[PDB]
Amino acid sequence: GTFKDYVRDRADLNKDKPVIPAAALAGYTGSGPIQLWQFLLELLTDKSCQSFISWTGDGWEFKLSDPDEVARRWGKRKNKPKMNYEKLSRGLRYYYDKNIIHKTAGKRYVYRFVCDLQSLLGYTPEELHAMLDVKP
Amino acid sequence: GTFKDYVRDRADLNKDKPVIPAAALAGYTGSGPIQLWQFLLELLTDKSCQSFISWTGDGWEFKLSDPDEVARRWGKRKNKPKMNYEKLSRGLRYYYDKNIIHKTAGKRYVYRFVCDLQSLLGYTPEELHAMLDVKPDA
DNA sequence: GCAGGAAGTGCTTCCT
DNA sequence: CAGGAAGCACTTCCTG
Secondary structure, eight states: OOHHHHHHHHHSSOSSOOSSOHHHHHHHHTOOSOOHHHHHHHHTTOTTTTTTOEEOSSTTEEEOSOHHHHHHHHHHHTTOTTOOHHHHHHHHHHHHHHTSEEEOTTSTTEEEEOSOHHHHHSOOHHHHHHHHTOOO | OOHHHHHHHHHTOOSSOOSSOHHHHHHHHTOSSOOHHHHHHHHHTOGGGGGTOEEOSSTTEEEOSSHHHHHHHHHHHTTOTTOOHHHHHHHHHTHHHHTSOOBOTTSSSEEEOOSOHHHHHSOOHHHHHHHTTOOOOO
16 A cells, blocks of 8 residues: 555545536536536535435435425525425426436335436446445 | 734735626525626626626626627536527527616627616626726727 | 527426 | 426527
């Protein structure tokens, strides 16, 4: 073990940041403004967020342990004080048809990315789970 | 001078900071995502941009001495590599009815905020001209 | 170039 | 928590 490695290891974050920052992806995609899912994706790639939202451990399956908090952030990111899970949800509903994210029937505040993320990001759920230290 | 002094002294600096940053305005008003007018307003209060965009010295009237650049920066802002004044001018054309901006008749690339920024921003056009050493056109 | 109609984009609002 | 249906602020096109 040398300083070379030390830097290498610290390279993979440890630092204080989200594996896939929304803005960045929006730039690599050129999708213009930031979209809901992109926002979430960053949430789910930042260990600091795992408290109110995280993955279930099953593929692109994730859960919103504390919606109100998520909706708080989403709204605050697009300067929308009157934001809430009620509205935020509606945004998600529009993702069903578009095949971007779907709902886990039977479970509340449980959804799953259905789009081809592995090929877009170049990361597999497990890689992410590992990096994020997902429990289940 | 104590510490707060030493702080304010060195903190007094911006040099590159625009008087009205679009995001902050969006924030204070909760207008949601940044909007083109709030954007242009940012650049007009950013001395650095006087090159391609600046005030005419009259009220809130201004000009785009170099559309193209403005277009590109704005395109960059919202991730729109295809942006150009041609499309951006469209945006601006929907403010005429919303009574936000209004194009000064008989001139090219010359519009004029017509909403009530004074009340909103707390500054008067003249105060801002001063802060930006603006030189009237003829 | 600049005034607008027209259609699409993506959430954000409203409401049944 | 769901939809259906409007809004809103542009982004893209096209016409004159």
